[PDB]
């Protein structure tokens, strides 16, 4: 198991050191940008499908005022 605990230990330190030295140096911005790009699944733009377009229809203003008047005191 030596080879295991050995390469595992040495490696562990190496990486850990890279992340510590990198994050501490804040030079490895490429990683953040990448992970951020892959993490931003919402990369795609917005898609209208609810009808939130200008012009308040009777139903809208009605739902707003109705919901407003009906709420509570303070």
From Swiss-Prot:
Source organism per UniProt: Homo sapiens
Job description of the protein: Myosins are actin-based motor molecules with ATPase activity. Unconventional myosins serve in intracellular movements. Myosin 6 is a reverse-direction motor protein that moves towards the minus-end of actin filaments. Has slow rate of actin-activated ADP release due to weak ATP binding. Functions in a variety of intracellular processes such as vesicular membrane trafficking and cell migration. Required for the structural integrity of the Golgi apparatus via the p53-dependent pro-survival pathway.
Changes after translation: Phosphorylation in the motor domain, induced by EGF, results in translocation of MYO6 from the cell surface to membrane ruffles and affects F-actin dynamics. Phosphorylated in vitro by p21-activated kinase (PAK).
Protein name as catalogued: Unconventional myosin-VI
Tissue: Expressed in most tissues examined including heart, brain, placenta, pancreas, spleen, thymus, prostate, testis, ovary, small intestine and colon. Highest levels in brain, pancreas, testis and small intestine. Also expressed in fetal brain and cochlea. Isoform 1 and isoform 2, containing the small insert, and isoform 4, containing neither insert, are expressed in unpolarized epithelial cells.
SUBUNIT field: Homodimer; dimerization seems to implicate the unfolding of the three-helix bundle region creating an additional calmodulin binding site, and cargo binding. Able to function as a monomer under specific conditions in vitro. Forms a complex with CFTR and DAB2 in the apical membrane of epithelial cells. Component of the DISP/DOCK7-induced septin displacement complex, at least composed of DOCK7, LRCH3 and MYO6.
GN (gene name): MYO6
Coiled-coil portions: none
Family as reported in the entry's similarity comment: Belongs to the TRAFAC class myosin-kinesin ATPase superfamily. Myosin family.
Swiss-Prot/TrEMBL domain comment: Divided into three regions: a N-terminal motor (head) domain, followed by a neck domain consisting of a calmodulin-binding linker domain and a single IQ motif, and a C-terminal tail region with a three-helix bundle region, a SAH domain and a unique globular domain required for interaction with other proteins such as cargo-binding.
Location(s), subcellular: Golgi apparatus, trans-Golgi network membrane; Golgi apparatus; Nucleus; Cytoplasm, Perinuclear region
Domain of life: Eukaryota
